[PDB]
């Protein structure tokens, strides 16, 4: 039981903390502009349009 | 960008064939295994000796 427990203890704190760190960093990226990260996504779609023609 | 032309080259596999389904001629196994299998396990022997691994 405890063999499972030491892995549970390392894996939870390191990974969940990292997850939290991403969430804050999308927002912070937004600030020098006013929305950089969530706009790069809207731009990619826009630039490419639909359809995309294969060559 | 995957082709079915490459998949012809490739295998999908788990042979029934394993060493020691070879009924004798043990030395010959340990000349083939010295040639094919062994430089993937250790490249260390062949650089330590300074030989180029047999092709």
């Amino acid at each position: 039981t405890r063999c499972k427990l030491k892995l549970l203890r390392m894996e939870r704190i390191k990974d969940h903390l990292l997850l939290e760190e991403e969430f804050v960093s999308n927002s912070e990226i937004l600030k020098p502009f006013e929305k950089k990260q969530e706009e790069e996504k809207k731009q990619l779609e826009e630039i490419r349009g639909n359809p995309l023609s294969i060559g | 960008d995957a082709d079915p032309m490459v998949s012809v080259m490739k295998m999908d596999k788990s042979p029934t064939e394993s060493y020691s389904d070879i009924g004798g001629l043990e030395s010959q196994i340990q000349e083939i295994k010295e040639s094919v299998e062994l430089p993937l396990t250790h490249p260390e022997l062949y650089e330590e000796m300074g030989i180029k691994p047999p092709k």
């Binding site: 063999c3 030491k6 892995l7 203890r9 894996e11 912070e28 | 250790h42």
Partner: protein, 906 residues
């Protein structure tokens, strides 16, 4: 199943699957009728048991549950456990499975909560008698194999865990907490836990570390000592006993904060002492960082023996194994005192003997030079350093050196590093002094300084027992009033002794590293040296070094570089303790300036080490805040700022490195990917932060001793051609060195590409040239590890000079420091009484399969290879012994350590 009454015994079993006629009806009516019939119930107790036994061979829920339902009620509903004390006490043995039937066989939230409390209580009361132990045993050793008992025995144990854990956190504790309504530890419940523990140690493993941990006291561990020491050979065998101890200890570093972790490991030393291998004892003793635990094993083999026998040779060997020589000083002194012979004992303990075998190993490996010989410009300076870097370890290249031409063509600070690079040819070798002596008495002060660095490097292979020590030569130079000379002198002295403390080393560094009043930037080396002596062992947290940091800041705030080095030295000093490092955190934080805070985060990594997941959230809030503050704005101050930003970045990383070695090997893997993702992240956020994060990455990797060494550096290496600070390359190669030309083939390719391909500045070029040659050694002459060998989860002391140099920008001035990058790992060979210079055979296996280790002890299968091998780095660190089949038996266990072998032929 069919109801066929009391005809025969087989049809009694079928009867009681639906409704007994000799357990529920009878006993109930009987109890509730007269009170002389409790005596007839006591006879019927024997009956209840036989019937239970027969149907603990079933596994269907329905027919043991429903059957036995009203007995579970009678306790509280009619008797109310008050008609008498012993008579209800001793009849709880049939009612306890009846209880289990709603806990475990069925699961229903309303009843499982309510009867949970009732099971705990009666487990406790009924264990004074010790009839509760026997019910527990009948299921642990079973009657039949069906699924049921495998969960039923599990619940009974889980009761005990529930209550004990809840008494430590809550301030309420005792039996008035409502977790299980049951007493703290009692006084006749205490004895119940000891009796359970034996049976469960015999048959199981699960609850054995666990019980300890819930209490959180070393006392629980000492109780454990007693039982395990009986057991060591008749219940299961010795080998097995060892794999158990360490599983508990390494595993529970995440569950143990400092004042507790040291005290638990005391006990684990004692288990090993009780047992026969005093070699397993020593491994743990190094681990403690205590001088005392080491002295006791040495006294144990030396003192009771009035002969040479095996016993004196075996002592010398054990103490030899640290490559710091923290053990070399302690084991010496008793050899001098007993006196059956000086000559063999003193050489064998010291690094004097490791020199003889090094020559033997060099003979296999040969010497292949592949250095360039570019002359003139900074390109001159690059090529003169590279020769030393290519011949780390004992190598020989005397004649090239003897020609002073290429020496006199070096210039500047460059000239200094050139004389110093010569010393690394003669690394772990006495001779060399002649080359060095020449420069020391002639020309400019520059060649004079570089000789002393080179003496440092050379002298590390022979210094213990004060026989022609580096101390003898280097003192004259320290006294001398010139700064460049003395700084050089005391650096070489730090190297030479390495992690060995003594009266002489300490006492040289005691009236210096305490004058920083008049401005210089080379008295970094002052404290740096004192910090180096301390590592790998117990500390005093010395006042000399803390004082001089303060004074330095008061005197000058121009020389941000001086104070940046000074800061890092404190943190290296404290390395090797963590509990005391808390006391002094406050002292540093006393005087407050935003400037002072830059140091604080650095010293934080050591203080918090071992309660280092409190250390992670801090060093991360510390990072986000810069970006956030900037945010608001978006929508002399110079010196503080620059220092401020770089320190946080070093500290965060520093924190990870020390933590990951000691704690889990598993997280080491995660930490390799995360670091690169961390560099990109900082690159966006803080402009200033980016230069520092590039360079730190190389020492993150080397300190932790990663398993994956091909994929990640190479992907990053390309990216860091574009990025600023070409010093990034040097740091990447320090990790890559490993077994050379496994990892280091791609390293050469990768670094040599970037350097030939674009020359955008010859400054940018110099770093790139050093790195490609640094990384290799011809056909794995010697690997480098920050790890000790003797423990893979301990920490070096020789490598702490490598660590220093990644926080600052590259300079010719930096170059002098990087020549040192000392620490060697001997290959193991079998020794006899005439110190044989070959081995018989060894097994190597990339990583052990086993899970019942977490420290390492190989599987026996392995992969066999012949005689005279270098012990491969990570991706082959486990090295096992083969000799058993030729009727030969090792005395000195190897697991993947540095330790040399000694053998008995029969």
């Amino acid at each position: 199943m069919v109801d066929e009454s009391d005809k025969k015994q087989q049809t009694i079993d079928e009867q009681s699957q639906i409704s007994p006629e000799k357990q529920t009806p009878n006993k109930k009516d009987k109890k509730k009728e007269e009170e002389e019939q409790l005596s007839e119930e006591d006879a019927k107790l024997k009956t209840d048991l036989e019937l239970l036994v027969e149907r603990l061979k079933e596994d269907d829920s329905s027919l043991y549950e429903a059957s036995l339902n009203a007995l579970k009620e009678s306790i509280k509903n009619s008797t109310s456990s008050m008609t008498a004390v012993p008579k209800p006490l001793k009849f709880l043995r049939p009612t306890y499975p009846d209880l289990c039937s709603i806990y475990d066989k069925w699961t229903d939230p309303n009843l499982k909560s309510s009867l949970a409390d009732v099971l705990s209580i009666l487990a406790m009361t009924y264990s004074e008698n010790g009839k509760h132990d026997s019910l527990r045993y009948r299921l642990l050793s079973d009657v039949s194999d069906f699924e049921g008992w495998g969960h039923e025995y599990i619940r009974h144990l889980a009761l005990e865990i529930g209550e004990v854990y809840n008494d430590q956190v809550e301030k309420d504790a005792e039996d008035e907490t409502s977790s299980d309504g049951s007493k703290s530890d009692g006084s006749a419940a205490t004895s119940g836990f000891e009796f359970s523990k034996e049976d469960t140690l015999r048959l199981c493993l699960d609850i054995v570390p666990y019980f300890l941990k819930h209490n959180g006291e070393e006392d629980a561990v000492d109780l454990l000592l007693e039982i395990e020491s009986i057991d060591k050979l008749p219940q299961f065998v010795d080998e097995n006993t060892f794999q158990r101890v360490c599983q508990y200890m390494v595993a529970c570093v995440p569950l143990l904060p400092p004042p507790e972790d040291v005290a638990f490991l005391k006990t684990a030393y004692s288990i090993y002492l009780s047992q026969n291998e005093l070699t397993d004892a020593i491994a743990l003793a190094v681990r403690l960082g205590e001088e005392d635990m080491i002295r006791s094993v040495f006294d144990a083999t030396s003192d009771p023996v009035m002969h040479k026998q095996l016993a004196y040779i075996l002592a010398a060997q054990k103490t030899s194994f640290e490559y710091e020589g923290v053990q070399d000083i302690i084991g010496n002194g008793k050899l001098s005192e007993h006196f059956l012979y000086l000559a063999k004992e003193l050489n064998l303990t010291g690094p004097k003997v490791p020199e003889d075998i090094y020559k033997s190993h060099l003979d296999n490996s040969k010497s292949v030079f592949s250095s360039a010989g570019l002359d003139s410009a900074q390109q001159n300076l690059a090529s003169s350093f590279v020769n030393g870097f290519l011949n780390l370890g004992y190598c020989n290249d005397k004649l090239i050196v003897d020609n002073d031409n290429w020496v006199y063509k070096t210039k500047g600070d460059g000239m200094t590093s050139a004389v110093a690079s010569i010393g690394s040819i003669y690394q772990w070798n006495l001779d060399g002094l002649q080359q060095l002596d020449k420069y020391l008495y002639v020309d400019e002060p520059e060649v004079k300084a570089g000789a002393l660095l080179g003496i440092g490097i050379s002298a590390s292979g022979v210094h213990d027992g004060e026989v022609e020590p580096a101390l003898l030569l280097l003192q004259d130079y320290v006294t001398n009033p010139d700064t460049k000379i003395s700084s050089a002198a005391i650096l070489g002295l730090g190297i030479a002794f390495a992690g060995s403390k003594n009266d002489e080393v300490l006492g040289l560094l005691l009236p210096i590293a305490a004058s920083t009043d008049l401005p210089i930037e080379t008295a970094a080396m002052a404290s740096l040296a004192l910090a180096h002596v301390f590592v790998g062992t117990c500390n005093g947290d010395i006042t000399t070094s803390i004082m001089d940091n303060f004074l330095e800041r008061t005197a000058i705030e121009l020389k941000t570089d001086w104070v940046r080095f000074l800061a890092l030295a404190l943190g290296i000093l404290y390395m090797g303790q963590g509990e005391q490092v808390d006391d002094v955190l406050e002292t540093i934080s006393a005087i407050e300036h935003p400037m002072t805070s830059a140091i604080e985060v650095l010293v934080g990594s050591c203080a918090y080490t071992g309660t280092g997941d409190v250390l992670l959230i801090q060093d991360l809030l510390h990072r986000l805040t810069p970006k956030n503050v900037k945010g608001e704005e978006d929508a002399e101050i110079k010196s503080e700022e620059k220092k401020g930003k770089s320190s946080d970045k070093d500290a965060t990383t520093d924190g990870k490195n020390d933590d990951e070695e000691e704690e889990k090997e598993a997280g080491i893997v995660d930490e390799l990917a995360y670091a690169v993702l961390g560099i990109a992240l900082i690159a966006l956020g803080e402009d200033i932060g980016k230069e520092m994060s590039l360079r730190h990455f190389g020492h993150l990797m080397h300190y932790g001793n990663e398993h994956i060494r091909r994929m990640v550096p190479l992907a990053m290496g390309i990216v860091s051609v574009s990025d600023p600070q070409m010093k990034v390359f040097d740091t990447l190669t320090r990790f890559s060195h490993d077994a050379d030309l496994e990892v280091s083939m791609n390293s050469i390719f990768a670094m040599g590409l970037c350097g030939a391909g674009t020359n955008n500045a010859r400054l940018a070029q110099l770093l790139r040239q050093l790195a490609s040659y640094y990384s290799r050694e011809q056909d794995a002459l010697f690997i480098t590890r920050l790890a000790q060998g003797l423990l893979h989860l301990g920490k070096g002391t020789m490598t702490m000079d490598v660590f220093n140099d990644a926080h600052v920008l590259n300079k010719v001035t930096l170059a002098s420091i990087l020549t040192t990058a000392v620490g060697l790992v001997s290959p193991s060979f079998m020794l006899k009484h005439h110190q044989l210079f070959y081995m018989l055979n060894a097994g190597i296996r990339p990583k052990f399969i086993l899970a019942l280790n977490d420290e390492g002890e190989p599987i026996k299968v392995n992969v066999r290879v012949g005689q005279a091998v270098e012990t491969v780095g990570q991706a082959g660190r486990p090295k096992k012994i083969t000799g058993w089949i030729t009727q030969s038996t090792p005395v000195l266990l190897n697991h993947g350590e540095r330790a040399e072998l000694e053998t008995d032929e029969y």
